[PDB]
Amino acid sequence: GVKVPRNFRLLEELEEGQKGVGDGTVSWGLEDDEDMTLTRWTGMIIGPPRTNYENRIYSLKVECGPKYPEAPPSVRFVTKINMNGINNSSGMVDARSIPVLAKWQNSYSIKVVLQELRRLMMSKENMKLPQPPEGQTYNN
Amino acid sequence: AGLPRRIIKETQRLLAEPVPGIKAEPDESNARYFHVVIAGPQDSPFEGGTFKLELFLPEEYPMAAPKVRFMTKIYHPNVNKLGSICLDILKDKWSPALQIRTVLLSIQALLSAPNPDDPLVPDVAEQWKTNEAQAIETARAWTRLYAMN
């Protein structure tokens, strides 16, 4: 059961982010290209079609703490969004409300988190929510 | 149960027989992960500095290369902004006959003899190529700023 240390796992994620995955509807990379701790990431999600998120690009901040990937990362939207599980004033993602975070496993990754959030944007309870104007961002 | 014999031996040989200018500590949780400190080599602009390096022995070691990375910021044409090391024996010239000891000395040798001609990094290499005196002074500056505590 050979565990890959945090820093080497995050280097694998960096390489995968640079190569891209799937159809490119989520992407991720380091927020600061000199951050040797590989802690702060920028996430991107393309809002899915036939939802009120469609044709919008969402930017997020993903923080991988000292216990990642044994522990889930923290996530917040920078782009404003009305979505269950996202605090509509700060953009913080409530881990208890997002199944991949609430039931985190060490096999998960930044890619999996972003793909889950994009999948949840298609849910009956999110896809119809009226959205803030495009382009707005939270403070901080 | 347990580590392969080779890894038991190589883990152990360190503590009984440290490499000159290099210290290692085991990670508190992961028996294949080590926290290394490399002294800047004698007569280099890194001399007097100490540089953190992390080392991991993956599942397929020694068929697979050990993974290493600097965790101290260093101005060197073969080390990038994230500490990744461009060294042949870490990729494509790895062979199971090689040992951790030899990898560490080879990294010391890289610090002692930078190679701007075949550079990771071209920003730093270009500086080392075209204004080597300034590049060496900058390497010393970064040693002062990042590698003295």
Side-chain angles (χ1 to χ4, degrees):
Chain A
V2 176
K3 193 150 298 195
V4 177
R6 173 182 182 282
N7 292 342
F8 292 100
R9 160 63 98 78
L10 286 165
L11 288 176
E12 297 169 348
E13 297 196 52
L14 183 74
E15 295 184 31
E16 186 187 22
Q18 289 168 336
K19 292 174 187 182
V21 300
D23 54 15
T25 53
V26 307
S27 73
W28 62 97
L30 265 184
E31 180 174 283
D32 172 13
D33 69 354
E34 309 186 6
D35 174 18
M36 297 180 134
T37 76
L38 311 174
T39 296
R40 295 165 286 282
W41 295 73
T42 304
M44 184 200 76
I45 295 169
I46 307 301
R50 302 170 300 275
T51 74
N52 289 346
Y53 308 111
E54 72 181 345
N55 304 136
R56 296 183 179 210
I57 302 188
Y58 293 88
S59 292
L60 300 89
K61 283 183 181 183
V62 179
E63 183 129 344
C64 298
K67 294 177 179 145
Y68 181 89
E70 293 298 322
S74 300
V75 184
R76 73 191 307 148
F77 280 81
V78 173
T79 310
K80 294 204 183 187
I81 193 174
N82 290 333
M83 182 177 172
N84 288 277
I86 286 54
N87 184 287
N88 115 320
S89 80
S90 70
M92 292 178 72
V93 174
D94 179 18
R96 69 181 177 258
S97 296
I98 306 300
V100 67
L101 299 174
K103 310 292 185 204
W104 179 260
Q105 306 293 314
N106 68 10
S107 54
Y108 295 162
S109 58
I110 298 163
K111 171 187 60 188
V112 168
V113 174
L114 296 177
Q115 292 175 334
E116 170 105 331
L117 289 168
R118 189 174 179 274
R119 179 183 68 86
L120 293 168
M121 285 174 187
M122 308 177 197
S123 80
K124 287 173 287 188
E125 72 169 2
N126 287 327
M127 67 183 271
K128 291 192 177 182
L129 289 173
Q131 296 300 310
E134 200 180 342
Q136 295 184 346
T137 60
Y138 303 103
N139 301 327
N140 310 331
Chain B
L3 296 168
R5 178 174 102 78
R6 167 154 177 174
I7 292 186
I8 292 173
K9 179 193 57 210
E10 287 201 83
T11 292
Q12 191 69 2
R13 187 140 49 227
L14 292 172
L15 285 318
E17 290 282 2
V19 187
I22 300 184
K23 295 149 48 196
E25 292 189 314
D27 185 74
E28 73 182 2
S29 309
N30 188 322
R32 291 169 167 269
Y33 182 37
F34 299 84
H35 304 286
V36 184
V37 180
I38 301 175
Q42 290 192 53
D43 297 325
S44 78
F46 312 108
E47 190 193 292
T50 54
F51 298 85
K52 299 184 177 186
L53 187 109
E54 64 185 349
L55 185 144
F56 171 62
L57 301 181
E59 288 190 304
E60 311 299 334
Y61 182 86
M63 287 295 314
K67 298 243 182 208
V68 304
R69 190 174 61 112
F70 280 103
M71 296 298 288
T72 297
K73 179 173 172 73
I74 182 170
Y75 191 80
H76 189 287
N78 312 111
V79 182
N80 76 14
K81 291 172 167 180
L82 297 181
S84 295
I85 302 169
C86 167
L87 183 63
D88 48 16
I89 61 172
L90 292 179
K91 270 170 186 185
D92 289 333
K93 291 187 186 161
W94 171 250
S95 143
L98 296 170
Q99 288 213 131
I100 294 162
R101 186 162 298 250
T102 302
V103 172
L104 298 175
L105 65 77
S106 194
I107 293 169
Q108 297 171 302
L110 183 62
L111 295 187
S112 184
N115 179 11
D117 303 284
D118 224 294
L120 180 25
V121 171
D123 167 276
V124 175
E126 180 67 11
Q127 266 291 284
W128 221 283
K129 278 190 177 83
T130 73
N131 196 337
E132 186 191 288
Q134 184 53 245
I136 293 167
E137 286 177 1
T138 299
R140 170 58 67 198
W142 288 27
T143 296
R144 297 186 179 104
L145 292 173
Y146 307 117
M148 297 300 287
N149 294 309

PDB file of all heavy atoms in Angstrom, chain A residues 25 45-58 79 118 121 131 133-135:
ATOM      1  N   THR A  25     -13.265  21.107 -20.191  1.00  0.00           N
ATOM      2  CA  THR A  25     -14.294  21.889 -19.503  1.00  0.00           C
ATOM      3  C   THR A  25     -13.981  22.153 -18.041  1.00  0.00           C
ATOM      4  O   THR A  25     -14.644  22.976 -17.403  1.00  0.00           O
ATOM      5  CB  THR A  25     -15.673  21.282 -19.615  1.00  0.00           C
ATOM      6  OG1 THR A  25     -15.632  19.919 -19.191  1.00  0.00           O
ATOM      7  CG2 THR A  25     -16.199  21.407 -21.086  1.00  0.00           C
ATOM      8  N   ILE A  45     -13.908  26.174 -14.254  1.00  0.00           N
ATOM      9  CA  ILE A  45     -15.012  25.328 -14.694  1.00  0.00           C
ATOM     10  C   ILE A  45     -15.796  26.070 -15.767  1.00  0.00           C
ATOM     11  O   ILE A  45     -16.215  27.223 -15.549  1.00  0.00           O
ATOM     12  CB  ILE A  45     -15.997  25.010 -13.530  1.00  0.00           C
ATOM     13  CG1 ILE A  45     -15.284  24.172 -12.465  1.00  0.00           C
ATOM     14  CG2 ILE A  45     -17.240  24.305 -14.080  1.00  0.00           C
ATOM     15  CD1 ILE A  45     -16.118  24.051 -11.163  1.00  0.00           C
ATOM     16  N   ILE A  46     -16.016  25.428 -16.914  1.00  0.00           N
ATOM     17  CA  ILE A  46     -16.947  25.997 -17.916  1.00  0.00           C
ATOM     18  C   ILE A  46     -18.379  25.608 -17.542  1.00  0.00           C
ATOM     19  O   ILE A  46     -18.672  24.425 -17.372  1.00  0.00           O
ATOM     20  CB  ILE A  46     -16.635  25.447 -19.325  1.00  0.00           C
ATOM     21  CG1 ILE A  46     -15.159  25.647 -19.694  1.00  0.00           C
ATOM     22  CG2 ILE A  46     -17.564  26.091 -20.354  1.00  0.00           C
ATOM     23  CD1 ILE A  46     -14.688  27.089 -19.697  1.00  0.00           C
ATOM     24  N   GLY A  47     -19.257  26.588 -17.347  1.00  0.00           N
ATOM     25  CA  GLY A  47     -20.643  26.246 -16.987  1.00  0.00           C
ATOM     26  C   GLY A  47     -21.248  25.317 -18.033  1.00  0.00           C
ATOM     27  O   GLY A  47     -21.060  25.521 -19.241  1.00  0.00           O
ATOM     28  N   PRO A  48     -21.994  24.305 -17.590  1.00  0.00           N
ATOM     29  CA  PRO A  48     -22.465  23.311 -18.580  1.00  0.00           C
ATOM     30  C   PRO A  48     -23.670  23.793 -19.386  1.00  0.00           C
ATOM     31  O   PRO A  48     -24.427  24.664 -18.932  1.00  0.00           O
ATOM     32  CB  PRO A  48     -22.814  22.085 -17.722  1.00  0.00           C
ATOM     33  CG  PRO A  48     -22.991  22.602 -16.318  1.00  0.00           C
ATOM     34  CD  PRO A  48     -22.147  23.864 -16.189  1.00  0.00           C
ATOM     35  N   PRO A  49     -23.857  23.216 -20.568  1.00  0.00           N
ATOM     36  CA  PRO A  49     -24.930  23.690 -21.442  1.00  0.00           C
ATOM     37  C   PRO A  49     -26.282  23.375 -20.864  1.00  0.00           C
ATOM     38  O   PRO A  49     -26.426  22.460 -20.043  1.00  0.00           O
ATOM     39  CB  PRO A  49     -24.707  22.869 -22.728  1.00  0.00           C
ATOM     40  CG  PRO A  49     -23.998  21.672 -22.312  1.00  0.00           C
ATOM     41  CD  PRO A  49     -23.085  22.123 -21.192  1.00  0.00           C
ATOM     42  N   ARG A  50     -27.270  24.141 -21.322  1.00  0.00           N
ATOM     43  CA  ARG A  50     -28.664  23.952 -20.954  1.00  0.00           C
ATOM     44  C   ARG A  50     -28.854  24.090 -19.446  1.00  0.00           C
ATOM     45  O   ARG A  50     -29.687  23.401 -18.864  1.00  0.00           O
ATOM     46  CB  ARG A  50     -29.201  22.603 -21.475  1.00  0.00           C
ATOM     47  CG  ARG A  50     -29.075  22.471 -23.006  1.00  0.00           C
ATOM     48  CD  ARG A  50     -29.368  21.060 -23.535  1.00  0.00           C
ATOM     49  NE  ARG A  50     -28.466  20.043 -22.984  1.00  0.00           N
ATOM     50  CZ  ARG A  50     -27.260  19.737 -23.473  1.00  0.00           C
ATOM     51  NH1 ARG A  50     -26.771  20.367 -24.540  1.00  0.00           N
ATOM     52  NH2 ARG A  50     -26.535  18.792 -22.885  1.00  0.00           N
ATOM     53  N   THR A  51     -28.040  24.953 -18.812  1.00  0.00           N
ATOM     54  CA  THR A  51     -28.210  25.387 -17.425  1.00  0.00           C
ATOM     55  C   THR A  51     -28.044  26.889 -17.388  1.00  0.00           C
ATOM     56  O   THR A  51     -27.551  27.459 -18.354  1.00  0.00           O
ATOM     57  CB  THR A  51     -27.150  24.792 -16.473  1.00  0.00           C
ATOM     58  OG1 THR A  51     -25.890  25.441 -16.675  1.00  0.00           O
ATOM     59  CG2 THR A  51     -27.014  23.297 -16.683  1.00  0.00           C
ATOM     60  N   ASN A  52     -28.412  27.559 -16.299  1.00  0.00           N
ATOM     61  CA  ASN A  52     -28.163  29.007 -16.207  1.00  0.00           C
ATOM     62  C   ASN A  52     -26.703  29.381 -16.026  1.00  0.00           C
ATOM     63  O   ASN A  52     -26.366  30.570 -16.041  1.00  0.00           O
ATOM     64  CB  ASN A  52     -29.009  29.680 -15.120  1.00  0.00           C
ATOM     65  CG  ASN A  52     -30.464  29.763 -15.477  1.00  0.00           C
ATOM     66  OD1 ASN A  52     -30.833  29.556 -16.627  1.00  0.00           O
ATOM     67  ND2 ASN A  52     -31.282  30.048 -14.501  1.00  0.00           N
ATOM     68  N   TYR A  53     -25.834  28.370 -15.919  1.00  0.00           N
ATOM     69  CA  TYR A  53     -24.391  28.596 -15.862  1.00  0.00           C
ATOM     70  C   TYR A  53     -23.755  28.592 -17.262  1.00  0.00           C
ATOM     71  O   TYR A  53     -22.554  28.802 -17.388  1.00  0.00           O
ATOM     72  CB  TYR A  53     -23.738  27.475 -15.033  1.00  0.00           C
ATOM     73  CG  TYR A  53     -24.383  27.289 -13.667  1.00  0.00           C
ATOM     74  CD1 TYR A  53     -25.108  26.146 -13.389  1.00  0.00           C
ATOM     75  CD2 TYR A  53     -24.235  28.245 -12.679  1.00  0.00           C
ATOM     76  CE1 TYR A  53     -25.660  25.942 -12.135  1.00  0.00           C
ATOM     77  CE2 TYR A  53     -24.792  28.054 -11.407  1.00  0.00           C
ATOM     78  CZ  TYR A  53     -25.515  26.907 -11.166  1.00  0.00           C
ATOM     79  OH  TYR A  53     -26.047  26.635  -9.911  1.00  0.00           O
ATOM     80  N   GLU A  54     -24.544  28.269 -18.295  1.00  0.00           N
ATOM     81  CA  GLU A  54     -23.972  28.001 -19.607  1.00  0.00           C
ATOM     82  C   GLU A  54     -23.232  29.230 -20.170  1.00  0.00           C
ATOM     83  O   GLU A  54     -23.614  30.377 -19.967  1.00  0.00           O
ATOM     84  CB  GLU A  54     -25.067  27.515 -20.561  1.00  0.00           C
ATOM     85  CG  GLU A  54     -26.038  28.558 -21.016  1.00  0.00           C
ATOM     86  CD  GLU A  54     -27.122  28.000 -21.937  1.00  0.00           C
ATOM     87  OE1 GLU A  54     -26.969  26.856 -22.459  1.00  0.00           O
ATOM     88  OE2 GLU A  54     -28.125  28.728 -22.139  1.00  0.00           O
ATOM     89  N   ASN A  55     -22.140  28.968 -20.865  1.00  0.00           N
ATOM     90  CA  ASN A  55     -21.357  30.026 -21.506  1.00  0.00           C
ATOM     91  C   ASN A  55     -20.689  30.964 -20.517  1.00  0.00           C
ATOM     92  O   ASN A  55     -20.274  32.077 -20.897  1.00  0.00           O
ATOM     93  CB  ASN A  55     -22.187  30.837 -22.532  1.00  0.00           C
ATOM     94  CG  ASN A  55     -22.825  29.972 -23.611  1.00  0.00           C
ATOM     95  OD1 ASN A  55     -24.002  30.158 -23.951  1.00  0.00           O
ATOM     96  ND2 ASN A  55     -22.055  29.030 -24.162  1.00  0.00           N
ATOM     97  N   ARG A  56     -20.556  30.526 -19.262  1.00  0.00           N
ATOM     98  CA  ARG A  56     -19.803  31.321 -18.293  1.00  0.00           C
ATOM     99  C   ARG A  56     -18.579  30.553 -17.832  1.00  0.00           C
ATOM    100  O   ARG A  56     -18.647  29.326 -17.613  1.00  0.00           O
ATOM    101  CB  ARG A  56     -20.659  31.684 -17.065  1.00  0.00           C
ATOM    102  CG  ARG A  56     -21.859  32.578 -17.417  1.00  0.00           C
ATOM    103  CD  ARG A  56     -22.603  32.948 -16.154  1.00  0.00           C
ATOM    104  NE  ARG A  56     -23.750  33.830 -16.382  1.00  0.00           N
ATOM    105  CZ  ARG A  56     -24.177  34.719 -15.493  1.00  0.00           C
ATOM    106  NH1 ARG A  56     -23.552  34.859 -14.333  1.00  0.00           N
ATOM    107  NH2 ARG A  56     -25.232  35.473 -15.739  1.00  0.00           N
ATOM    108  N   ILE A  57     -17.462  31.262 -17.680  1.00  0.00           N
ATOM    109  CA  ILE A  57     -16.259  30.644 -17.138  1.00  0.00           C
ATOM    110  C   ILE A  57     -16.136  30.999 -15.666  1.00  0.00           C
ATOM    111  O   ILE A  57     -16.157  32.174 -15.305  1.00  0.00           O
ATOM    112  CB  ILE A  57     -15.016  31.155 -17.878  1.00  0.00           C
ATOM    113  CG1 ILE A  57     -15.126  30.860 -19.376  1.00  0.00           C
ATOM    114  CG2 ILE A  57     -13.767  30.499 -17.240  1.00  0.00           C
ATOM    115  CD1 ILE A  57     -13.806  31.184 -20.188  1.00  0.00           C
ATOM    116  N   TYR A  58     -16.048  29.981 -14.818  1.00  0.00           N
ATOM    117  CA  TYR A  58     -15.922  30.183 -13.377  1.00  0.00           C
ATOM    118  C   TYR A  58     -14.489  29.953 -12.967  1.00  0.00           C
ATOM    119  O   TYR A  58     -13.915  28.901 -13.276  1.00  0.00           O
ATOM    120  CB  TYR A  58     -16.830  29.193 -12.604  1.00  0.00           C
ATOM    121  CG  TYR A  58     -18.277  29.524 -12.864  1.00  0.00           C
ATOM    122  CD1 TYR A  58     -18.947  28.974 -13.955  1.00  0.00           C
ATOM    123  CD2 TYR A  58     -18.933  30.472 -12.083  1.00  0.00           C
ATOM    124  CE1 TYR A  58     -20.265  29.358 -14.239  1.00  0.00           C
ATOM    125  CE2 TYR A  58     -20.243  30.873 -12.367  1.00  0.00           C
ATOM    126  CZ  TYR A  58     -20.888  30.314 -13.458  1.00  0.00           C
ATOM    127  OH  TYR A  58     -22.185  30.700 -13.749  1.00  0.00           O
ATOM    128  N   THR A  79     -15.375  33.751  -9.097  1.00  0.00           N
ATOM    129  CA  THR A  79     -16.529  34.197  -9.901  1.00  0.00           C
ATOM    130  C   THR A  79     -17.830  33.972  -9.113  1.00  0.00           C
ATOM    131  O   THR A  79     -18.050  32.880  -8.561  1.00  0.00           O
ATOM    132  CB  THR A  79     -16.591  33.367 -11.192  1.00  0.00           C
ATOM    133  OG1 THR A  79     -15.304  33.376 -11.801  1.00  0.00           O
ATOM    134  CG2 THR A  79     -17.666  33.842 -12.138  1.00  0.00           C
ATOM    135  N   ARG A 118     -18.810  20.771 -11.495  1.00  0.00           N
ATOM    136  CA  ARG A 118     -19.447  20.959 -12.790  1.00  0.00           C
ATOM    137  C   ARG A 118     -20.657  20.030 -12.986  1.00  0.00           C
ATOM    138  O   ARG A 118     -21.699  20.441 -13.513  1.00  0.00           O
ATOM    139  CB  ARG A 118     -18.422  20.741 -13.894  1.00  0.00           C
ATOM    140  CG  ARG A 118     -18.996  21.135 -15.253  1.00  0.00           C
ATOM    141  CD  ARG A 118     -17.928  21.074 -16.359  1.00  0.00           C
ATOM    142  NE  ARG A 118     -18.529  21.443 -17.636  1.00  0.00           N
ATOM    143  CZ  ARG A 118     -19.141  20.522 -18.372  1.00  0.00           C
ATOM    144  NH1 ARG A 118     -19.200  19.273 -17.904  1.00  0.00           N
ATOM    145  NH2 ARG A 118     -19.708  20.836 -19.509  1.00  0.00           N
ATOM    146  N   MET A 121     -23.606  21.364 -11.140  1.00  0.00           N
ATOM    147  CA  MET A 121     -24.248  22.497 -11.809  1.00  0.00           C
ATOM    148  C   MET A 121     -25.414  22.048 -12.704  1.00  0.00           C
ATOM    149  O   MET A 121     -26.308  22.836 -12.998  1.00  0.00           O
ATOM    150  CB  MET A 121     -23.227  23.264 -12.674  1.00  0.00           C
ATOM    151  CG  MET A 121     -22.281  24.109 -11.841  1.00  0.00           C
ATOM    152  SD  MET A 121     -21.002  24.828 -12.897  1.00  0.00           S
ATOM    153  CE  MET A 121     -19.922  25.582 -11.653  1.00  0.00           C
ATOM    154  N   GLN A 131     -28.904  33.651 -11.849  1.00  0.00           N
ATOM    155  CA  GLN A 131     -27.520  33.935 -11.513  1.00  0.00           C
ATOM    156  C   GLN A 131     -27.257  35.429 -11.348  1.00  0.00           C
ATOM    157  O   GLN A 131     -27.990  36.257 -11.881  1.00  0.00           O
ATOM    158  CB  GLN A 131     -26.611  33.362 -12.632  1.00  0.00           C
ATOM    159  CG  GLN A 131     -26.716  31.852 -12.719  1.00  0.00           C
ATOM    160  CD  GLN A 131     -26.302  31.174 -11.408  1.00  0.00           C
ATOM    161  OE1 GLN A 131     -25.237  31.469 -10.860  1.00  0.00           O
ATOM    162  NE2 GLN A 131     -27.177  30.333 -10.865  1.00  0.00           N
ATOM    163  N   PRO A 133     -25.095  38.866 -12.295  1.00  0.00           N
ATOM    164  CA  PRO A 133     -24.547  39.284 -13.588  1.00  0.00           C
ATOM    165  C   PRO A 133     -23.185  38.662 -13.815  1.00  0.00           C
ATOM    166  O   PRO A 133     -22.424  38.450 -12.869  1.00  0.00           O
ATOM    167  CB  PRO A 133     -24.366  40.794 -13.444  1.00  0.00           C
ATOM    168  CG  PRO A 133     -25.182  41.186 -12.380  1.00  0.00           C
ATOM    169  CD  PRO A 133     -25.432  40.012 -11.450  1.00  0.00           C
ATOM    170  N   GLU A 134     -22.888  38.426 -15.082  1.00  0.00           N
ATOM    171  CA  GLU A 134     -21.657  37.808 -15.473  1.00  0.00           C
ATOM    172  C   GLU A 134     -20.531  38.746 -15.141  1.00  0.00           C
ATOM    173  O   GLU A 134     -20.665  39.991 -15.152  1.00  0.00           O
ATOM    174  CB  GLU A 134     -21.666  37.505 -16.982  1.00  0.00           C
ATOM    175  CG  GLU A 134     -20.667  36.438 -17.436  1.00  0.00           C
ATOM    176  CD  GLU A 134     -20.728  36.178 -18.931  1.00  0.00           C
ATOM    177  OE1 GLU A 134     -21.734  36.560 -19.535  1.00  0.00           O
ATOM    178  OE2 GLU A 134     -19.756  35.623 -19.510  1.00  0.00           O
ATOM    179  N   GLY A 135     -19.438  38.104 -14.781  1.00  0.00           N
ATOM    180  CA  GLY A 135     -18.197  38.785 -14.528  1.00  0.00           C
ATOM    181  C   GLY A 135     -17.938  39.142 -13.070  1.00  0.00           C
ATOM    182  O   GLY A 135     -16.777  39.364 -12.783  1.00  0.00           O
TER     183      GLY A 135
END
